[PDB]
Design a protein around this ligand. Structure first.
Ligand SMILES: COc1ccc(-c2noc(C(=O)NCCc3ccc(C(=O)N4CCC4)cc3)n2)cc1OC
Length: 277
């Protein structure tokens, strides 16, 4: 049921049966979030979830791709993800295609680019932590002294966090390690997206598009306030289908909206199963 980074949500039969759906975790969550979707897919659809690993998006896909091949061979591959999971699913479709495997479906559940690129600069690192420090002033009713920008500016996202957590530990506050893990992993996993090196894909992608990012995403990164109609994918994906679903990014994975995703996806899986049979 949990084997390394692979969660079994519905086991495939010992032999034969329908094409599995591989789902990839969101930042801060596990693949149990795909249970509602599973309920709106056809009976006996197998489903396996890929849980977090470390590295860049490319490095994470380098860990997943071998495991995908161990599980499902030449194909067909059906890859699905919400939020960061959608970025991970796509990265896997690229890795699999370079190895000549047969990718038939890539379903992105509101995996939408920031409305403009997030600069990877020292100035942007300073601005981002100034915003974060101001929120923390308000929230924890404190004054924050001068941020040690020289220190933070040379560190990766991970380093920036551990530095900030070492400095919070330093004075006063002892945080439950479970709270720290959860906040640190959510934060780093969502930041890994900003430097994804998106490659062109030659197959069909389906983007389930909500109306907007929710407020906490915008707080994390204000460029999520704007989105383009193709969610940023059009330059990389010639064969791009968008399925508007409405609502907010945070709601897209849950009932009732997931009913709309599953209905559409069920027809795509049906077509795939007919094309083999
Ligand atoms: C073509 O290039 C791209 C296409 C798509 C995306 C992309 N796809 O999905 C996302 C995404 O899901 N981003 C995180 C959004 C988020 C969600 C929750 C919280 C959240 O609620 N919180 C943080 C703590 C609370 C924050 C941010 N980005 C990126 C691309 O290039 C980089």
């Amino acid at each position: 049921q949990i084997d390394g980074f692979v969660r079994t949500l519905r086991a495939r039969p010992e032999a034969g049966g329908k094409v599995p759906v591989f789902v990839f975790h969101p930042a801060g969550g596990s693949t149990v979030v795909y249970e509602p979707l599973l309920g709106r897919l056809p009976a006996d659809t197998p489903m396996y979830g890929f849980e977090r690993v470390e590295g860049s998006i490319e490095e994470r896909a380098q860990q997943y791709v071998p495991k995908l091949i161990e599980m499902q061979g030449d194909g067909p591959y059906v890859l699905v993800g919400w939020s960061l999971g959608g970025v991970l699913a796509y990265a896997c479709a690229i890795g699999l295609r370079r190895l000549g495997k047969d990718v038939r479906f890539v379903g992105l559940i509101d995996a939408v680019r920031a409305g403009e690129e997030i600069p990877q600069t020292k100035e942007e690192i300073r601005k981002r932590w100034d915003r974060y420090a101001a929120f923390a002033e308000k929230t924890f009713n404190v004054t924050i002294p001068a941020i040690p920008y020289e220190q933070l500016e040379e560190l990766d996202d991970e380093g920036q966090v551990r530095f900030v957590l070492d400095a919070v530990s330093q004075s006063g506050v002892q945080i439950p390690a479970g709270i720290i893990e959860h906040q640190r992993t959510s934060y780093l996993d969502n930041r890994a997206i900003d430097t994804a090196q998106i490659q062109p894909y030659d197959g069909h992608v389906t983007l389930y598009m909500a109306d907007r990012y929710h407020d906490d995403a915008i707080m994390f990164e204000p460029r999520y306030a704007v989105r383009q109609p193709d969610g940023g994918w059009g330059e990389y994906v010639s064969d791009l289908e968008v399925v508007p679903i409405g609502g907010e990014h945070i709601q897209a994975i849950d009932e009732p909206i997931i009913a709309k995703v599953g209905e559409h996806m069920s027809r795509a899986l049906g077509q795939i199963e007919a094309d083999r049979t």
